[PDB]
């Protein structure tokens, strides 16, 4: 990426309805997740 004034994109951590989500790598690290349709209520693995 061309060098100057452009978001950092540093490894991060995020959650789910179940436990954590790994891969991450986001600028503005450490965010939060209400729901996951793959942790999966609310779609997959139906109900």
């Amino acid at each position: 990426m061309k060098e100057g004034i452009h978001p950092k994109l540093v490894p991060a951590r995020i959650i789910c309805g179940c436990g954590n989500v790994i891969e991450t790598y986001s600028t503005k690290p450490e965010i939060y997740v209400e729901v996951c349709s793959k942790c999966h209520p609310f779609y997959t693995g139906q109900q």
């Binding site: 990426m1 004034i5 452009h6 978001p7 994109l9 995020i14 789910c16 989500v21 790994i22 891969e23 991450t24 790598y25 986001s26 600028t27 503005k28 965010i31 939060y32 997740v33 209400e34 729901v35 996951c36 349709s37 793959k38 942790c39 609310f42 779609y43 997959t44």
Partner: protein, 179 residues
């Protein structure tokens, strides 16, 4: 340069696709280039300074500063002097493509009301697939206390797949919630 889904493509998505279609060459197997995100905004036209929240919060969720579209021709119905900015278009590749693409699949699409799955027919027949979003706050980096106003985008994803079949296969096996 690591990026879990990138890895999961090479180890376990690639071979499943070789077993399934079968391939003389390592190259023929569909690879994944260029997920390009485009916000068409009339939403900011005569006021073009509304843009740069929508541009800065684009770069926040992709991790890349978008460039700015402008107007092909002048169309009188909505405004549209041949000059003005319509929206942002950011091209994503290579890691930075995946780093965003996994965050898309583990977070974004979960966070939509409903989400009965991704429409299966959006493959363009030459074996790319694009879709479109509304509330940008389905993303992690968007807190709904940073939203001035909602606007979506159109996400196109391109693939070295020559056909639509293999397009869905590549995307399914990358864990694309589908129908």
């Amino acid at each position: 340069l690591d990026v879990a889904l990138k890895r999961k493509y090479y180890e376990e998505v690639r071979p499943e696709l070789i077993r399934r279609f079968g391939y003389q060459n390592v190259w023929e197997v569909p690879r994944l280039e260029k997920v390009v995100i485009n916000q068409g905004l009339g939403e900011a036209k005569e006021d073009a300074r509304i843009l740069e929240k929508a541009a800065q919060e684009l770069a926040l969720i992709t991790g890349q500063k978008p460039a700015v579209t402008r107007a092909k021709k002048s169309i009188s119905n909505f405004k549209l002097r041949k000059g003005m900015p319509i929206g942002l278009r950011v091209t994503l590749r290579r890691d930075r493509m995946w780093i965003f693409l996994e965050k898309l699949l583990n977070v974004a699409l979960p966070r939509i009301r409903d989400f009965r799955g991704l429409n299966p027919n959006s493959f363009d027949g030459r074996g790319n697939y694009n879709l479109g979003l509304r509330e940008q706050l389905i993303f992690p980096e968007i807190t709904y206390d940073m939203v001035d106003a909602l606007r979506g985008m159109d996400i196109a994803v391109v693939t070295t797949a020559e056909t639509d079949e293999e397009a869905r296969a590549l995307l399914e096996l990358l864990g694309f919630p589908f129908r």
